[PDB]
Paper text:
The structure was solved by molecular replacement using a RoseTTAFold model. Fvan-cmp consists of two distinct domains, the N- and C-domains, that are connected by a linker. Fvan-cmp shares the same nucleophilic serine found within this motif. Fvan-cmp lacks this glycine and instead contains a phenylalanine in the same structural position.
PGHs are composed of two domains: the N- and C-domains. The N-domain is a novel tertiary fold with an as-yet unknown function that is found across all kingdoms of life.
Numbering used by the authors: 13 to 616
The structure:
Amino acid sequence: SHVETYYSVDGATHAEKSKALKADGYRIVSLSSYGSPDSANYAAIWVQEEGPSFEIIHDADEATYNSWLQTWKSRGYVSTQVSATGPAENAVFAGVMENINVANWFQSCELENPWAFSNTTGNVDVVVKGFRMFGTPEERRYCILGHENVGNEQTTIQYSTPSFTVNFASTFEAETTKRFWRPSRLFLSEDHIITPSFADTSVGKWSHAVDLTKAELKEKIETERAKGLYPIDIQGGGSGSSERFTVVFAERTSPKPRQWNVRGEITGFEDNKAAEEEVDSIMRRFMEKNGVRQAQFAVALEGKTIAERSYTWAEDDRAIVEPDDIFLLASVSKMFLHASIDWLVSHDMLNFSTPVYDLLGYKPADSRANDINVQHLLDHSAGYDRSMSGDPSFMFREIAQSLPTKGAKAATLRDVIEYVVAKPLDFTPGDYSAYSNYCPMLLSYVVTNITGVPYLDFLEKNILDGLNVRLYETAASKHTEDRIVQESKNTGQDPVHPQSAKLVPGPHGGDGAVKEECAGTFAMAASASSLAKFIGSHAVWGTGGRVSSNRDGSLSGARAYVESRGTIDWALTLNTREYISETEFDELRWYSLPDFLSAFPIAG
Ligand SMILES: *[C@@H]1O[C@H](CO)[C@@H](O[C@@H]2O[C@H](CO)[C@@H](O[C@@H]3O[C@H](CO)[C@@H](O)[C@H](O[C@H]4O[C@H](CO)[C@@H](O)[C@H](O)[C@@H]4O)[C@@H]3O)[C@H](O)[C@H]2NC(C)=O)[C@H](O)[C@H]1NC(C)=O
Ligand SMILES: *[C@@H]1O[C@H](CO)[C@@H](O[C@@H]2O[C@H](CO)[C@@H](O)[C@H](O)[C@H]2NC(C)=O)[C@H](O)[C@H]1NC(C)=O
């Protein structure tokens, strides 16, 4: 639990301190090598706790390191730290091998490009555990070490190549704007380039400093120690006068464990308690394997909830999901648009046959766009193929920049429509269907245009019948204390501030959508229960009353599924789409949960 740190020590001092700390029940959790290969310096962190046997090496040339690596590999040991300093031909190496059980690990110190590490790892997702960009600027070499990502941990590392240098301040700001995201390591090269790695695991309060002299580091370590933060990473770079340090501090030595929580009741089943045990077992296996933190399952019969199970597999700093919490619905949002158009047609305010752009007063660049009717947009047969021409729903930034205001103002729904009506169709209306986010955007504008009511107002008054279905607002700052965390590793350029260079999280504009203009297509949020209830009297797919079909949505931060099968309706919400693969999700929604509904009947 006690944390011992040293930095700016030579091989001989490292070896003395190592032998004494180890003999007094410490294990090495961080090793950095830096400086000149003829006089390398070391920074190390040691934690006083029990654990498996380990081996360390330092001042090792390539031959000695590879021989020692291969030797301890052959004895079941696993590389957990790797560092190198100097020109390729002349480099010295340091490392830690541990007697741990890791299925698959990978390491190369011969990479000339860090992106080449994927060829080493094949089809296996890894968490990078060790790194050093060594060599020289003209002849760059990389040590990269990765462990198989058991638990599907969410991580990033931003590499610098001979042809691109990471701006550390802007990367650090972008990555830590994502909720719970924190530095794991701040790797540092001899030419003072930071290669930072991030995680959304929790070590309590944390802090960091970069570009520190040993004097500044010593002060910073004392400052943080008084506050009860201890070093979890330390990295040196440079020799002599230009020696500098990165450091990350945390309250804890290791990530908090996740804890399992379930809320809600199954009420309308033959054997309610045996139904809970089985579906809990299914969801628990899925969430543990895929590292999913927050999820909901719900069954409804004729618009009435007969089952709700809300699931948390999360550290104690994530809210415990309840059945009435709301999840970003992504393209499940579309069934509310279909219901809105159904309302307008059956109240004689619109026809399936109504030509849309003539109704709006637009003169398309494509004569064929004059034939696009309400039905074409419901069916996605209107002529918009995003595989050919890209997806307008994620082009708000590029669209705003094309305006006369030249990116000073965010693009509106109307701006996207005007942009699209001035571009050709990809195909003749009605020839085939191509799944389109844009088609229900244009129909959401038609709803406002015909009624003079904002789409959200129209939904509350005439469609939702008091269901808590809400716009998921774009801005990250509106979501910083939300119970439900919409999780993505991803960041992108900001469509709300189209002249800003600063990357925003994927669920908060990073994916390229302004959610305020996408209520009709994927920007709504609701409970699984609200979904299961709604599809009881509305088409889950297509337009009209209840049908036997299903609908899903995928955005950065969200996965949702709803299905009407037989007499009942069921829904599933996840706080992520970054589960392991589609095959994990498809198995859950197409075998596991349907096979549960078969094996556990509703009340007789
Ligand atoms: C249904 O959708 C259509 C298509 O979007 C929409 O028609 C558009 O309405 C706007 C008004 O909101 C029209 O824009 C006007 O165009 C005239 C010239 O033709 C301009 O001079 C107008 O300027 C006024 O407004 C400006 C902005 O506040 C001010 O800068 C200025 O001082 C003026 O007061 C104005 O821009 C637009 O031409 C149509 N577009 C088409 C293709 O018809 C329609 O209003 C929607 N209907 C409903 C009921 O919502
Ligand atoms: C929906 O369809 C009906 C029937 O085609 C349309 O009603 C017609 O409107 C046009 C234009 O004003 C008239 O010339 C016809 O005489 C109307 N027919 C009838 C039977 O009333 C209606 O305009 C369409 N709605 C929309 C919004 O396009």
